[PDB]
Structure 1
Amino acid sequence: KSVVKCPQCGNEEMNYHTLQLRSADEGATVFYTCTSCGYKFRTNN
């Protein structure tokens, strides 16, 4: 019953990881970190 488009070089492959930092009231900060060229940035809301 348990059965029942990276701006520097140009490459669509670039890593990202989001964290909800301070509270649930704000937006999750969408971080971006590159592998092809190496430019990094973030985006909130």
Structure 2
Amino acid sequence: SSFQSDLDFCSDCGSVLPLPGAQDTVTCIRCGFNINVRDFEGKVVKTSVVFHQLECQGPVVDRRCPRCGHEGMAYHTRQMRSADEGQTVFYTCTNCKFQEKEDS
């Protein structure tokens, strides 16, 4: 006449057993079914919080740098104006990394 449930619930109704308190048996509320407080010795709850577990700068074009005079500069495009005109080209030198922009 006994049912196997989780230890946190009554085994005759299905209702929730309260926390242990100032007595030696914890009882359900809606039926009055006493269970030993001593039976919660295997009520173990684990929780693990894991904090911390376990280039060539684009294509090049053979353009001379303003500062260092290197023969090539890496380029990147970005259409920064409206859709009416242009395409703004960003350059970056290979050696000394001097970045200038052209607006066409």
| Residue number in structure 2 paired with 1:43 | 102
- 1:21 partnered with 2:80: yes
Q: Is the 8 A contact 2:87 2:103 kept in 1?
A: yes
| Displacement after TM superposition at 1:14 (Å) | 1.2
Highest CA radius of gyration, 1 or 2? Answer: 2
| Displacement after TM superposition at 1:35 (Å) | 2.3
| Displacement after TM superposition at 1:7 (Å) | 1.1
| Displacement after TM superposition at 1:25 (Å) | 0.8
Gaps of 5+ in 2: 1-63
Structure 1's 12 and 22: CA in aligned 2 closer, same or farther, altered over 3 A? same
- 1:6 partnered with 2:65: yes
| Displacement after TM superposition at 1:23 (Å) | 2.7
* TM-score normalized with structure 1 length: 0.69
* CA-atom RMSD in angstroms: 1.4
CA distance in 2, matches of 1:36, 1:22: 29
Structure 1 moving runs of 4+ over 4 Å: none
CA distance in 2, matches of 1:21, 1:9: 27
Gaps of 5+ in 1: none
Identity %: 59
CA distance in 1, matches of 2:102, 2:94: 18
* TM-score normalized with structure 2 length: 0.35
